[PDB]
Write a protein that holds these residues in place. Structure first.
Motif, PDB file in Angstrom:
ATOM      1  N   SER A 190      49.927 -17.647  11.026  1.00 25.71           N
ATOM      2  CA  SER A 190      49.545 -16.345  10.600  1.00 25.71           C
ATOM      3  C   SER A 190      48.223 -15.892  11.443  1.00 25.71           C
ATOM      4  CB  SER A 190      49.443 -16.274   9.144  1.00 25.71           C
ATOM      5  N   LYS A 191      48.244 -14.829  12.308  1.00 24.44           N
ATOM      6  CA  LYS A 191      47.251 -14.095  12.871  1.00 24.44           C
ATOM      7  C   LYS A 191      47.133 -13.997  14.247  1.00 24.44           C
ATOM      8  CE  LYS A 191      43.096 -12.308  11.070  1.00 24.44           C
ATOM      9  NZ  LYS A 191      44.140 -11.096  11.537  1.00 24.44           N
ATOM     10  N   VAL A 192      46.203 -13.955  14.856  1.00 27.30           N
ATOM     11  CA  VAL A 192      46.096 -13.549  16.401  1.00 27.30           C
ATOM     12  C   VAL A 192      45.787 -14.837  17.428  1.00 27.30           C
ATOM     13  CG1 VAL A 192      45.438 -11.780  17.894  1.00 27.30           C
ATOM     14  CG2 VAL A 192      45.782 -11.320  15.532  1.00 27.30           C
ATOM     15  N   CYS A 193      46.411 -14.675  18.429  1.00 24.03           N
ATOM     16  CA  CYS A 193      46.247 -15.797  19.539  1.00 24.03           C
ATOM     17  C   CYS A 193      44.885 -15.191  20.259  1.00 24.03           C
ATOM     18  CB  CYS A 193      47.317 -16.015  20.497  1.00 24.03           C
ATOM     19  SG  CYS A 193      46.859 -17.054  22.047  1.00 24.03           S
ATOM     20  N   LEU A 208      50.494 -20.521  15.733  1.00 18.50           N
ATOM     21  CA  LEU A 208      49.056 -20.471  16.099  1.00 18.50           C
ATOM     22  C   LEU A 208      48.678 -21.800  15.824  1.00 18.50           C
ATOM     23  CD1 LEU A 208      47.141 -17.658  14.525  1.00 18.50           C
ATOM     24  CD2 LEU A 208      47.609 -17.892  16.897  1.00 18.50           C
ATOM     25  N   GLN A 209      47.972 -22.693  16.682  1.00 15.03           N
ATOM     26  CA  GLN A 209      47.402 -23.672  16.367  1.00 15.03           C
ATOM     27  C   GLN A 209      45.978 -23.954  16.823  1.00 15.03           C
ATOM     28  OE1 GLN A 209      49.507 -25.956  14.767  1.00 15.03           O
ATOM     29  NE2 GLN A 209      51.372 -24.712  15.174  1.00 15.03           N
ATOM     30  N   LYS A 210      45.137 -24.843  16.383  1.00 16.49           N
ATOM     31  CA  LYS A 210      44.172 -25.161  16.745  1.00 16.49           C
ATOM     32  C   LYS A 210      43.814 -26.005  17.864  1.00 16.49           C
ATOM     33  CE  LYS A 210      41.588 -25.428  12.011  1.00 16.49           C
ATOM     34  NZ  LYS A 210      41.091 -26.588  11.048  1.00 16.49           N
ATOM     35  N   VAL A 211      43.251 -25.620  19.006  1.00 18.50           N
ATOM     36  CA  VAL A 211      42.782 -26.831  20.169  1.00 18.50           C
ATOM     37  C   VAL A 211      41.350 -26.849  20.163  1.00 18.50           C
ATOM     38  CG1 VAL A 211      43.026 -27.083  22.524  1.00 18.50           C
ATOM     39  CG2 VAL A 211      44.779 -25.892  21.424  1.00 18.50           C
ATOM     40  N   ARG A 212      40.687 -27.911  19.809  1.00 20.41           N
ATOM     41  CA  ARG A 212      39.280 -28.161  20.110  1.00 20.41           C
ATOM     42  C   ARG A 212      39.104 -28.791  21.413  1.00 20.41           C
ATOM     43  NH1 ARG A 212      37.666 -32.343  15.585  1.00 20.41           N
ATOM     44  NH2 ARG A 212      39.694 -33.294  16.935  1.00 20.41           N
ATOM     45  N   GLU A 218      31.178 -28.441  21.083  1.00 13.44           N
ATOM     46  CA  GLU A 218      32.750 -28.240  20.593  1.00 13.44           C
ATOM     47  C   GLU A 218      33.046 -27.125  20.370  1.00 13.44           C
ATOM     48  OE1 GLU A 218      33.997 -31.428  18.664  1.00 13.44           O
ATOM     49  OE2 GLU A 218      35.213 -30.571  16.928  1.00 13.44           O
ATOM     50  N   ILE A 219      33.929 -26.392  20.951  1.00 12.79           N
ATOM     51  CA  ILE A 219      34.463 -25.105  20.812  1.00 12.79           C
ATOM     52  C   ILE A 219      35.783 -25.218  20.452  1.00 12.79           C
ATOM     53  CG2 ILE A 219      35.097 -23.088  22.257  1.00 12.79           C
ATOM     54  CD1 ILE A 219      31.875 -24.300  22.184  1.00 12.79           C
ATOM     55  N   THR A 220      36.127 -24.373  19.391  1.00 11.27           N
ATOM     56  CA  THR A 220      37.489 -24.579  18.866  1.00 11.27           C
ATOM     57  C   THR A 220      38.443 -23.290  18.951  1.00 11.27           C
ATOM     58  OG1 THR A 220      38.655 -24.387  16.882  1.00 11.27           O
ATOM     59  CG2 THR A 220      36.546 -25.458  17.342  1.00 11.27           C
ATOM     60  N   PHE A 221      39.542 -23.253  19.496  1.00 10.38           N
ATOM     61  CA  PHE A 221      40.342 -21.718  19.709  1.00 10.38           C
ATOM     62  C   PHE A 221      41.539 -21.768  18.725  1.00 10.38           C
ATOM     63  CE2 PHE A 221      38.142 -22.492  23.795  1.00 10.38           C
ATOM     64  CZ  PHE A 221      38.046 -21.161  24.308  1.00 10.38           C
ATOM     65  N   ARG A 222      41.734 -20.656  18.301  1.00  6.45           N
ATOM     66  CA  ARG A 222      43.214 -20.452  17.491  1.00  6.45           C
ATOM     67  C   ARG A 222      44.165 -19.858  18.492  1.00  6.45           C
ATOM     68  NH1 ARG A 222      42.831 -16.726  13.689  1.00  6.45           N
ATOM     69  NH2 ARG A 222      44.054 -17.830  12.014  1.00  6.45           N
ATOM     70  N   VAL A 223      45.208 -20.429  18.987  1.00  6.66           N
ATOM     71  CA  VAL A 223      45.864 -19.962  19.610  1.00  6.66           C
ATOM     72  C   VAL A 223      47.401 -20.226  19.574  1.00  6.66           C
ATOM     73  CG1 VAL A 223      45.190 -22.069  21.050  1.00  6.66           C
ATOM     74  CG2 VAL A 223      46.247 -20.437  22.399  1.00  6.66           C
ATOM     75  N   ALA A 224      48.102 -19.537  20.238  1.00  9.34           N
ATOM     76  CA  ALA A 224      49.562 -19.595  19.954  1.00  9.34           C
ATOM     77  C   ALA A 224      50.134 -20.991  20.963  1.00  9.34           C
ATOM     78  CB  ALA A 224      50.224 -18.472  20.537  1.00  9.34           C
ATOM     79  N   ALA A 225      50.856 -21.669  20.518  1.00  8.91           N
ATOM     80  CA  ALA A 225      51.209 -22.928  21.251  1.00  8.91           C
ATOM     81  C   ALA A 225      51.567 -22.557  22.752  1.00  8.91           C
ATOM     82  CB  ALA A 225      52.347 -23.727  20.636  1.00  8.91           C
ATOM     83  N   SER A 226      52.184 -21.646  23.135  1.00 12.96           N
ATOM     84  CA  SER A 226      52.563 -21.073  24.192  1.00 12.96           C
ATOM     85  C   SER A 226      51.277 -21.192  25.251  1.00 12.96           C
ATOM     86  CB  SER A 226      53.216 -19.688  24.479  1.00 12.96           C
ATOM     87  OG  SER A 226      52.427 -18.664  23.702  1.00 12.96           O
TER      88      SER A 226
END
Ligand SMILES: [Mg+2]
Ligand SMILES: [Mg+2]
Ligand SMILES: [Mg+2]
Ligand SMILES: [Mg+2]
Ligand SMILES: [Mg+2]
Ligand SMILES: [Mg+2]
Ligand SMILES: [Mg+2]
Ligand SMILES: [Mg+2]
Ligand SMILES: [Mg+2]
Ligand SMILES: [Mg+2]
Ligand SMILES: [Mg+2]
Ligand SMILES: [Mg+2]
Ligand SMILES: [Mg+2]
Ligand SMILES: [Mg+2]
Ligand SMILES: [Mg+2]
Ligand SMILES: [Mg+2]
Ligand SMILES: [Mg+2]
Ligand SMILES: [Mg+2]
Ligand SMILES: [Mg+2]
Ligand SMILES: [Mg+2]
Ligand SMILES: [Mg+2]
Ligand SMILES: [Mg+2]
Ligand SMILES: [Mg+2]
Ligand SMILES: [Mg+2]
Ligand SMILES: [Mg+2]
Ligand SMILES: [Mg+2]
Ligand SMILES: [Mg+2]
Ligand SMILES: [Mg+2]
Ligand SMILES: [Mg+2]
Ligand SMILES: [Mg+2]
Ligand SMILES: [Mg+2]
Ligand SMILES: [Mg+2]
Ligand SMILES: [Mg+2]
Ligand SMILES: [Mg+2]
Ligand SMILES: [Mg+2]
Ligand SMILES: [Mg+2]
Ligand SMILES: [Mg+2]
Ligand SMILES: [Mg+2]
Ligand SMILES: [Mg+2]
Ligand SMILES: [Mg+2]
Ligand SMILES: [Mg+2]
Ligand SMILES: [Mg+2]
Ligand SMILES: [Mg+2]
Ligand SMILES: [Mg+2]
Ligand SMILES: [Mg+2]
Ligand SMILES: [Mg+2]
Ligand SMILES: [Mg+2]
Ligand SMILES: [Mg+2]
Ligand SMILES: [Mg+2]
Ligand SMILES: [Mg+2]
Ligand SMILES: [Mg+2]
Ligand SMILES: [Mg+2]
Ligand SMILES: [Mg+2]
Ligand SMILES: [Mg+2]
Ligand SMILES: [Mg+2]
Ligand SMILES: [Mg+2]
Ligand SMILES: [Mg+2]
Ligand SMILES: [Mg+2]
Ligand SMILES: [Mg+2]
Ligand SMILES: [Mg+2]
Ligand SMILES: [Mg+2]
Ligand SMILES: [Mg+2]
Ligand SMILES: [Mg+2]
Ligand SMILES: [Mg+2]
Ligand SMILES: [Mg+2]
Ligand SMILES: [Mg+2]
Ligand SMILES: [Mg+2]
Ligand SMILES: [Mg+2]
Ligand SMILES: [Mg+2]
Ligand SMILES: [Mg+2]
Ligand SMILES: [Mg+2]
Ligand SMILES: [Mg+2]
Ligand SMILES: [Mg+2]
Ligand SMILES: [Mg+2]
Ligand SMILES: [Mg+2]
Ligand SMILES: [Mg+2]
Ligand SMILES: [Mg+2]
Ligand SMILES: [Mg+2]
Ligand SMILES: [Mg+2]
Ligand SMILES: [Mg+2]
Ligand SMILES: [Mg+2]
Ligand SMILES: [Mg+2]
Ligand SMILES: [Mg+2]
Ligand SMILES: [Mg+2]
Ligand SMILES: [Mg+2]
Ligand SMILES: [Mg+2]
Ligand SMILES: [Mg+2]
Ligand SMILES: [Mg+2]
Ligand SMILES: [Mg+2]
Ligand SMILES: [Mg+2]
Ligand SMILES: [Mg+2]
Ligand SMILES: [Mg+2]
Ligand SMILES: [Mg+2]
Ligand SMILES: [Mg+2]
Ligand SMILES: [Mg+2]
Ligand SMILES: [Mg+2]
Ligand SMILES: [Mg+2]
Ligand SMILES: [Mg+2]
Ligand SMILES: [Mg+2]
Ligand SMILES: [Mg+2]
Ligand SMILES: [Mg+2]
Ligand SMILES: [Mg+2]
Ligand SMILES: [Mg+2]
Ligand SMILES: [Mg+2]
Ligand SMILES: [Mg+2]
Ligand SMILES: [Mg+2]
Ligand SMILES: [Mg+2]
Ligand SMILES: [Mg+2]
Ligand SMILES: [Mg+2]
Ligand SMILES: [Mg+2]
Ligand SMILES: [Mg+2]
Ligand SMILES: [Mg+2]
Ligand SMILES: [Mg+2]
Ligand SMILES: [Mg+2]
Ligand SMILES: [Mg+2]
Ligand SMILES: [Mg+2]
Ligand SMILES: [Mg+2]
Ligand SMILES: [Mg+2]
Ligand SMILES: [Mg+2]
Ligand SMILES: [Mg+2]
Ligand SMILES: [Mg+2]
Ligand SMILES: [Mg+2]
Ligand SMILES: [Mg+2]
Ligand SMILES: [Mg+2]
Ligand SMILES: [Mg+2]
Ligand SMILES: [Mg+2]
Ligand SMILES: [Mg+2]
Ligand SMILES: [Mg+2]
Ligand SMILES: [Mg+2]
Ligand SMILES: [Mg+2]
Ligand SMILES: [Mg+2]
Ligand SMILES: [Mg+2]
Ligand SMILES: [Mg+2]
Ligand SMILES: [Mg+2]
Ligand SMILES: [Mg+2]
Ligand SMILES: [Mg+2]
Ligand SMILES: [Mg+2]
Ligand SMILES: [Mg+2]
Ligand SMILES: [Mg+2]
Ligand SMILES: [Mg+2]
Ligand SMILES: [Mg+2]
Ligand SMILES: [Mg+2]
Ligand SMILES: [Mg+2]
Ligand SMILES: [Mg+2]
Ligand SMILES: [Mg+2]
Ligand SMILES: [Mg+2]
Ligand SMILES: [Mg+2]
Ligand SMILES: [Mg+2]
Ligand SMILES: [Mg+2]
Ligand SMILES: [Mg+2]
Ligand SMILES: [Mg+2]
Ligand SMILES: [Mg+2]
Ligand SMILES: [Mg+2]
Ligand SMILES: [Mg+2]
Ligand SMILES: [Mg+2]
Ligand SMILES: [Mg+2]
Ligand SMILES: [Mg+2]
Ligand SMILES: [Mg+2]
Ligand SMILES: [Mg+2]
Ligand SMILES: [Mg+2]
Ligand SMILES: [Mg+2]
Ligand SMILES: [Mg+2]
Ligand SMILES: [Mg+2]
Ligand SMILES: [Mg+2]
Ligand SMILES: [Mg+2]
Ligand SMILES: [Mg+2]
Ligand SMILES: [Mg+2]
Ligand SMILES: [Mg+2]
Ligand SMILES: [Mg+2]
Ligand SMILES: [Mg+2]
Ligand SMILES: [Mg+2]
Ligand SMILES: [Mg+2]
Ligand SMILES: [Mg+2]
Ligand SMILES: [Mg+2]
Ligand SMILES: [Mg+2]
Ligand SMILES: [Mg+2]
Ligand SMILES: [Mg+2]
Ligand SMILES: [Mg+2]
Ligand SMILES: [Mg+2]
Ligand SMILES: [Mg+2]
Ligand SMILES: [Mg+2]
Ligand SMILES: [Mg+2]
Ligand SMILES: [Mg+2]
Ligand SMILES: [Mg+2]
Ligand SMILES: [Mg+2]
Ligand SMILES: [Mg+2]
Ligand SMILES: [Mg+2]
Ligand SMILES: [Mg+2]
Ligand SMILES: [Mg+2]
Ligand SMILES: [Mg+2]
Ligand SMILES: [Mg+2]
Ligand SMILES: [Mg+2]
Ligand SMILES: [Mg+2]
Ligand SMILES: [Mg+2]
Ligand SMILES: [Mg+2]
Ligand SMILES: [Mg+2]
Ligand SMILES: [Mg+2]
Ligand SMILES: [Mg+2]
Ligand SMILES: [Mg+2]
Ligand SMILES: [Mg+2]
Ligand SMILES: [Mg+2]
Ligand SMILES: [Mg+2]
Ligand SMILES: [Mg+2]
Ligand SMILES: [Mg+2]
Ligand SMILES: [Mg+2]
Ligand SMILES: [Mg+2]
Ligand SMILES: [Mg+2]
Ligand SMILES: [Mg+2]
Ligand SMILES: [Mg+2]
Ligand SMILES: [Mg+2]
Lengths: 97, 147
Positions: free
Chosen positions: A1-4, A45-49, A56-64
């Motif tokens: 739920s939300k934005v890449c 949406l998933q977390k990539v750290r 440590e940067i973390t992104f909320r990003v669509a799997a694609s």
RNA sequence: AGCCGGUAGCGGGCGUGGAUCCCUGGAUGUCCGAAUGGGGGAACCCGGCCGGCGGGAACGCCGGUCACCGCGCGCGCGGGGGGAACCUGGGGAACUGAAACAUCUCAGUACCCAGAGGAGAGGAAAGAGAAAUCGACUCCCUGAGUAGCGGCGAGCGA
RNA sequence: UGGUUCGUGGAGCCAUGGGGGAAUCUGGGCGGACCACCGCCUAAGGCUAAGUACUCCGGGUGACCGAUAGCGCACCAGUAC
RNA sequence: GUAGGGAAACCGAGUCCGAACAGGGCGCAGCGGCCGCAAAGUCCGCGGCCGUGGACCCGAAACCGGGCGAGCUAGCCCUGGCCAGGGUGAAGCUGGGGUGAGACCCAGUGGAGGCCCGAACCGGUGGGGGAUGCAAACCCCUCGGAUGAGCUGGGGCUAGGAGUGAAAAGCUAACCGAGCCCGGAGAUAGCUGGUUCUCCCCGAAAUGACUUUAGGGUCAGCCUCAGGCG
RNA sequence: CGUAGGGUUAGGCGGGACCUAAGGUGAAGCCGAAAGGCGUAGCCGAAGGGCAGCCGGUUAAUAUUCCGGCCCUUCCCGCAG
RNA sequence: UGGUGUUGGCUCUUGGUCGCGCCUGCGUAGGAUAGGUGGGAGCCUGUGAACCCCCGCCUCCGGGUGGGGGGGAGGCGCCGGUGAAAUACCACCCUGGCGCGGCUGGGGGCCUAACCCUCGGAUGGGGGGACAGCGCUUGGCGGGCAGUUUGACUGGGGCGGU
RNA sequence: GGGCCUGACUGCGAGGCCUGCAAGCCGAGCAGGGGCGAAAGCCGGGCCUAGUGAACCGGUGGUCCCGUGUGGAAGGGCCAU
């Protein structure tokens, strides 16, 4: 739920159509719609750290666009990034898009 | 997913080599632990340039030596020593053969590189191998003589 | 050539040395308000730093300055809020019509939200679609209630 | 899934939430499933006057009203209440 | 508009069905003396009626959107406050008795409790009165609770298919089986009501068929006007 | 009630330049199509905590406020210990 | 709730498959067990024959094949017996099976690093762990909720009847 | 009751019955190809009046009519059911 954070992919609204009956192409009388109601389709949406500049940067990003995060990390090498905050690193990273 | 190994890795592959792993493996183990890097075009280039640069300095040493086969192998190093009949009073060391080889014939050498177990203690005609590079073994003919 | 607003009166003044009045520019502009030093029950309260006043240290007043976010190497720039309709975008009903009703209709309307701006949108073909053609987009007429779409119903409509 | 006249239809096109996933002109998209042929066009970056909409505002004009009309308000009204 | 026929290809004063040169469906053909006149048709005006719009006006109960409300009321949260006087007399404790030790019994002391009586306070049982009231829930008499699941001030939170509810579909600002305001909105109303000057001519129907129809419609019958026939 | 004129005097009463309560708000941080929803700290928030004034006199009308008498608090500066 | 993404490493066991090594096939008839279709008129042997004994392996009970050891210059075809097709020897491919491997589907175990939880300490430790969660999609249960439908005639309506 | 037969026709159809519509009903005759009869002639189901269901959507056989630049194809039309 939300934005890449990378692709910009947002939740979209889609109809959910319920149908009944046999298709014409299969020799049926035809399909009848027995309901249409709105629903949403979310981005996957998933977390990539990632560690970049020892932070440590973390992104909320669509799997694609999971690979687009790592590609950003690569383009990050040419950058004077150390000493910066992880908010600050991510901004620089993002700007590389 | 194609990654370039940064190390030898048990039944995966050898350093510098380009292998194919599940994205999970690459992202969550290989990459974070420094063991490999994405086979991007940009760092595929780099691996190629390293293969290229190593191969230059290697075939460039297999030439610095082969050329030193040409300076030696075409001479005799002559060492006068105070000696009587066949046995020498002092001796000719590799450290000597070198310090000899510089004075006459010009060529500088590393004593330690020369294959001489114990200092030569007899007059005669000696053939001693140099090894300035493995695979490029040199024949140094050395005449140890009296007076 | 009168004038001190509506507005006369008491009580006083100004104007051909050009008043009142009109237009433009400027100055002043308490407090609140995006409201932004901080707080707060808007128009009140309470501060820090620099400078000033008073006899002035306590106390008080005056001037300047101090919110947050974004972008750019603490400093610069910018943002914030409003605007009757109009505009785009993100969301988005129901009565009703179908002489009942669910698909359908009403209608992508009403409405909420964001954003712009004097307009906005769109715009320089990965177009159209049959002509060996045309030549961005927008807007009007027409094509045409055509083609079609449609519980092939009601209707909808390029 | 939406958009289109197209309500699953023979359903292409444009768009895209999910999965898979290329090529650089001998590349690609399109002409209503699909195939061939024959053509059209060059996606995945951005800007762009004008012609268009509106009327808080100013002015002009009415086979428009004339104080129960005309704006809710001709008047100290978004007031009294 | 000048051509129609056919699902169409298509043909064309024809064409469609058909084997048909058959039969049939649907189609095709001015006045006077070259002149004038009329006319297909079409344009504009005017009028009647129809379709789409709120479409003759007024009226729902309702539905939906977005807001406004817990200063009333309901629950809970924080912090305070209040409850005259009187009565009953639990446990315990002390002493006496009892016993092997005990249980236990008695006395005194004690002062418990959704205990009792009864003001304040909170209620609202029965009756009477009030009934264009003093009052849109009051008054008098009577009556329930009154240390508790008590009452109450202040400060807070929870709301509309939602809250809250010791539960009555109660209450959520004097009408709640779904609050109020504004908007969609002139919802819809096959129902009820209302529909405004004058004269003149004609003049019905209340049946039949069908109808989720029956007090509503479509067609027909019956009225009226214009043109033609005679 | 109409017109006018007068009338409310504080370091000590109450509240503020003190504290926290529910709750509210809210750096950090989390979430959500937009609007927005949360959220340890902190901040706000009192009829709770903290804090120094009693008796009398006076006015047409104010008084722990003015006056009188007797007391007291904090801040600044200074002197002494 | 299936599939798939997020989602990884090792292993065992099974199933699919391809790549090899392989072995494997028993009617009348024909020596013996003849899988096909060709190449084929010759092959083998100190890369030690005729044959003698022991083990494995399928076993149509006749053998077949794989090994160990003596003997250590011998054996089978073509012809012809011969049947549908015939013999030595080389292939291309089947029946079935075995072991290596790739590639995989299903189960079991284990791991840690995604992800989740947690720890005064946090580029770390501990726990769960590729499950759970979450995205897309499949089918189901579903008055918790929503929108509605629930005929007419009728000596009122209902009930009955039509 | 028996013999032969399939007219339980195909293409039509003058004219009527009935009738708000839409339906329903009767039907001489001509043509094609037949059956029975020596022939006249009869036969387009049944002595008759009930034995039924509009349109929409779809199935199947046929036709070869349309086919989204073109040839096909998809899909439709048309006749029959
Ligand atoms: Mg669905
Ligand atoms: Mg179908
Ligand atoms: Mg079909
Ligand atoms: Mg349908
Ligand atoms: Mg991750
Ligand atoms: Mg995708
Ligand atoms: Mg993917
Ligand atoms: Mg004045
Ligand atoms: Mg005067
Ligand atoms: Mg004067
Ligand atoms: Mg002048
Ligand atoms: Mg000015
Ligand atoms: Mg001032
Ligand atoms: Mg201001
Ligand atoms: Mg402020
Ligand atoms: Mg503020
Ligand atoms: Mg100062
Ligand atoms: Mg002074
Ligand atoms: Mg001073
Ligand atoms: Mg002063
Ligand atoms: Mg100041
Ligand atoms: Mg200041
Ligand atoms: Mg803004
Ligand atoms: Mg603005
Ligand atoms: Mg929109
Ligand atoms: Mg948006
Ligand atoms: Mg939308
Ligand atoms: Mg909109
Ligand atoms: Mg909604
Ligand atoms: Mg509806
Ligand atoms: Mg309506
Ligand atoms: Mg209608
Ligand atoms: Mg309706
Ligand atoms: Mg209706
Ligand atoms: Mg109804
Ligand atoms: Mg409806
Ligand atoms: Mg309507
Ligand atoms: Mg619509
Ligand atoms: Mg509007
Ligand atoms: Mg704005
Ligand atoms: Mg303009
Ligand atoms: Mg413009
Ligand atoms: Mg523009
Ligand atoms: Mg261009
Ligand atoms: Mg036309
Ligand atoms: Mg139709
Ligand atoms: Mg529409
Ligand atoms: Mg699609
Ligand atoms: Mg659509
Ligand atoms: Mg269709
Ligand atoms: Mg389509
Ligand atoms: Mg996509
Ligand atoms: Mg090309
Ligand atoms: Mg290509
Ligand atoms: Mg495309
Ligand atoms: Mg395509
Ligand atoms: Mg195409
Ligand atoms: Mg095209
Ligand atoms: Mg094109
Ligand atoms: Mg633009
Ligand atoms: Mg211009
Ligand atoms: Mg423009
Ligand atoms: Mg204009
Ligand atoms: Mg004007
Ligand atoms: Mg006038
Ligand atoms: Mg008046
Ligand atoms: Mg008026
Ligand atoms: Mg008048
Ligand atoms: Mg006005
Ligand atoms: Mg008025
Ligand atoms: Mg007034
Ligand atoms: Mg004819
Ligand atoms: Mg005729
Ligand atoms: Mg005319
Ligand atoms: Mg009419
Ligand atoms: Mg209307
Ligand atoms: Mg109207
Ligand atoms: Mg009308
Ligand atoms: Mg109404
Ligand atoms: Mg109601
Ligand atoms: Mg309803
Ligand atoms: Mg409702
Ligand atoms: Mg509402
Ligand atoms: Mg609401
Ligand atoms: Mg209350
Ligand atoms: Mg309350
Ligand atoms: Mg308390
Ligand atoms: Mg209390
Ligand atoms: Mg009490
Ligand atoms: Mg008592
Ligand atoms: Mg008592
Ligand atoms: Mg005691
Ligand atoms: Mg005792
Ligand atoms: Mg006692
Ligand atoms: Mg007691
Ligand atoms: Mg007592
Ligand atoms: Mg009691
Ligand atoms: Mg009692
Ligand atoms: Mg009393
Ligand atoms: Mg009291
Ligand atoms: Mg009560
Ligand atoms: Mg009573
Ligand atoms: Mg009584
Ligand atoms: Mg009573
Ligand atoms: Mg009574
Ligand atoms: Mg009474
Ligand atoms: Mg009453
Ligand atoms: Mg009483
Ligand atoms: Mg009593
Ligand atoms: Mg009592
Ligand atoms: Mg009693
Ligand atoms: Mg009680
Ligand atoms: Mg009592
Ligand atoms: Mg009591
Ligand atoms: Mg009690
Ligand atoms: Mg209590
Ligand atoms: Mg209270
Ligand atoms: Mg309160
Ligand atoms: Mg309260
Ligand atoms: Mg609550
Ligand atoms: Mg609430
Ligand atoms: Mg509310
Ligand atoms: Mg409601
Ligand atoms: Mg309900
Ligand atoms: Mg409702
Ligand atoms: Mg509820
Ligand atoms: Mg209660
Ligand atoms: Mg009840
Ligand atoms: Mg109210
Ligand atoms: Mg009430
Ligand atoms: Mg309701
Ligand atoms: Mg109420
Ligand atoms: Mg409103
Ligand atoms: Mg409406
Ligand atoms: Mg209306
Ligand atoms: Mg209705
Ligand atoms: Mg009228
Ligand atoms: Mg008469
Ligand atoms: Mg009647
Ligand atoms: Mg009748
Ligand atoms: Mg009938
Ligand atoms: Mg009928
Ligand atoms: Mg009716
Ligand atoms: Mg009629
Ligand atoms: Mg008559
Ligand atoms: Mg007449
Ligand atoms: Mg007075
Ligand atoms: Mg004082
Ligand atoms: Mg005080
Ligand atoms: Mg101060
Ligand atoms: Mg404070
Ligand atoms: Mg505080
Ligand atoms: Mg908040
Ligand atoms: Mg908090
Ligand atoms: Mg503070
Ligand atoms: Mg206080
Ligand atoms: Mg206090
Ligand atoms: Mg104080
Ligand atoms: Mg005192
Ligand atoms: Mg007084
Ligand atoms: Mg006074
Ligand atoms: Mg004093
Ligand atoms: Mg001192
Ligand atoms: Mg699911
Ligand atoms: Mg999975
Ligand atoms: Mg484990
Ligand atoms: Mg572990
Ligand atoms: Mg872990
Ligand atoms: Mg474990
Ligand atoms: Mg999972
Ligand atoms: Mg997630
Ligand atoms: Mg699926
Ligand atoms: Mg489902
Ligand atoms: Mg229901
Ligand atoms: Mg159900
Ligand atoms: Mg409805
Ligand atoms: Mg029903
Ligand atoms: Mg029904
Ligand atoms: Mg009902
Ligand atoms: Mg029904
Ligand atoms: Mg009835
Ligand atoms: Mg009856
Ligand atoms: Mg009746
Ligand atoms: Mg009757
Ligand atoms: Mg009766
Ligand atoms: Mg009757
Ligand atoms: Mg019944
Ligand atoms: Mg009957
Ligand atoms: Mg015969
Ligand atoms: Mg006829
Ligand atoms: Mg008829
Ligand atoms: Mg005949
Ligand atoms: Mg005949
Ligand atoms: Mg005959
Ligand atoms: Mg006949
Ligand atoms: Mg019969
Ligand atoms: Mg019969
Ligand atoms: Mg229908
Ligand atoms: Mg129907
Ligand atoms: Mg059909
Ligand atoms: Mg074509
Ligand atoms: Mg054709
Ligand atoms: Mg095409
Ligand atoms: Mg072809
Ligand atoms: Mg053709
Ligand atoms: Mg074909
Ligand atoms: Mg076909
Ligand atoms: Mg066909
Ligand atoms: Mg037909
Ligand atoms: Mg026929």
């Amino acid at each position: 739920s939300k934005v890449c954070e990378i692709s910009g992919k947002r939740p979209i609204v889609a109809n959910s159509i319920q149908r009944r009956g046999k298709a014409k192409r299969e020799g049926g009388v035809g399909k009848k719609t027995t309901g249409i109601s709105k629903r949403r389709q979310y981005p996957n949406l998933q977390k990539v750290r990632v560690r970049v500049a020892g932070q440590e940067i973390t992104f909320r990003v669509a799997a694609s666009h999971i690979p687009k995060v790592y590609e950003l990390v690569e383009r990050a090498k040419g950058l004077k990034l150390e000493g910066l905050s992880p908010k600050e690193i991510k901004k620089e990273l993002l700007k590389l898009l | 997913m194609k990654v370039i190994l940064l190390e030898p890795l048990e039944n995966l592959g050898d350093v510098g080599q380009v292998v194919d792993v599940k994205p999970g493996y690459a992202r969550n183990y290989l990459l974070p632990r420094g063991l490999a890097v994405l086979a991007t075009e940009s760092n595929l280039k780099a691996l190629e340039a390293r293969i290229r640069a190593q191969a230059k300095r290697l075939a460039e040493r297999k030439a610095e030596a082969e050329r030193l086969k040409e300076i030696l192998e075409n001479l005799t190093l002559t060492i006068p020593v105070r000696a009587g009949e066949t046995k020498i009073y002092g001796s000719v060391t590799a450290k000597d053969i070198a310090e000899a080889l510089s004075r006459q014939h010009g060529v500088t050498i590393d004593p330690k590189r020369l294959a001489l177990e114990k200092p030569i203690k007899e007059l005669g005609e000696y053939v001693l191998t140099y090894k300035p590079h493995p695979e490029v073994p040199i024949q140094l003919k050395v005449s140890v003589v009296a007076q």
